[PDB]
Amino acid sequence: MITAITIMALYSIVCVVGLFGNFLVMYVIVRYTKMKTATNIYIFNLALADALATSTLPFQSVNYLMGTWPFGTILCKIVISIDYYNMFTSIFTLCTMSVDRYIAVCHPVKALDFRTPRNAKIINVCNWILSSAIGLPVMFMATTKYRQGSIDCTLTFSTWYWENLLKICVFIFAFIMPVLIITVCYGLMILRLKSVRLLSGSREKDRNLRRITRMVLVVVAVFIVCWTPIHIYVIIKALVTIPETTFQTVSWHFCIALGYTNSCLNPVLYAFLDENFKRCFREFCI
């Protein structure tokens, strides 16, 4: 009752803040050509994924009040599909950003040649296709179930094999491999920063490179912190078949809520960790 409405209010606040902040980030990225660097394109893609994953929050939060899905089976399909599209899009975007930082730092000779914004858009498109390669089955195999109590939106499979195969594919191709790639790139970026006096020659350019790399690393760490609980909890609950309990339900709710809250948390990080973003967030809002 009181807890239910409190959770609904928290979800609504997170949802509205998420759409507002991510739409603002997208607009300030698309506003100016000086905001069209290789890193900014991937920031745009991450904000796009967050905005898509937040637009479905009011539908997901309304169900807590009646336990019924009156919106429609097509909306259930779209919501469930975006719920799986978000992870892949965001994590592959972060992996591409971290590899881009390595190309910039440890190979500056070919960095400007191979980090053309058109190339970055090509890599973003490749990210979208790779995300589709594991999201489209969820799009086709999601449908509403006309339960005796009320209509609910759940996934369907032909099921104990495919349901676990999808989870294994997500955990392998969407968490461990991108995290390892990011770690591998940064473990050499750090050494290249330490052992080299000047990266770009210009002190201002070197400072900008190091600051934007710090911001990228902080965003990556924030996403990792926000998304490890849900992936690990999903894997474990299937692995050892944790039975229903109050603590288990609270942990599940917290994991989902924080994974969704990351979408609204991102604009705070961009505002607090980049001078240009902070200036844009005040110029356009005034």
């Epitope: 920063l193 006096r197 002190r203 201002e204 070197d206 400072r207």
Partner: nanobody
């Protein structure tokens, strides 16, 4: 980070002095400069992290500057000192506040050297 200089004192002509500079993310360059009351600063030495050294025309053949990267301490051995080498010698170091920070220069307080007794 504070730059401390020492080793400066009254020395008879022809004596020897061991100058010292101490700095407490990574120190790449460290230099020395001399300044007379009626003269502008003239570069005397310049050493990198690798250890390559560059000297002034009059300084050459009498000044030896070497870097101890383990302690991040540089020292300048002063040889064949003449009264014309009476000035305040300064230690200048370039470093980075943090790994993600920019390159920044630092000026020492200066040590006074007088060759006469």
């Amino acid at each position: 980070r504070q730059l401390v200089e020492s080793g400066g004192g009254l020395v008879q002509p022809g004596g020897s002095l061991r100058l010292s500079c101490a700095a407490s993310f990574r120190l790449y360059d460290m230099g020395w400069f001399r300044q007379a009351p009626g003269k502008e600063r003239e570069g005397v030495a310049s050493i990198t992290s690798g250890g390559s050294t560059k000297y002034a025309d009059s300084v050459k053949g009498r000044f030896t500057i070497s870097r101890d990267n383990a302690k991040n301490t540089v020292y300048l051995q002063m040889n064949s000192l003449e009264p014309e080498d009476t000035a305040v010698y300064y230690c200048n170091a370039e470093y980075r506040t943090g790994i993600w920070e920019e390159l920044l220069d630092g000026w020492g307080k200066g040590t006074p050297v007088t060759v006469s007794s």
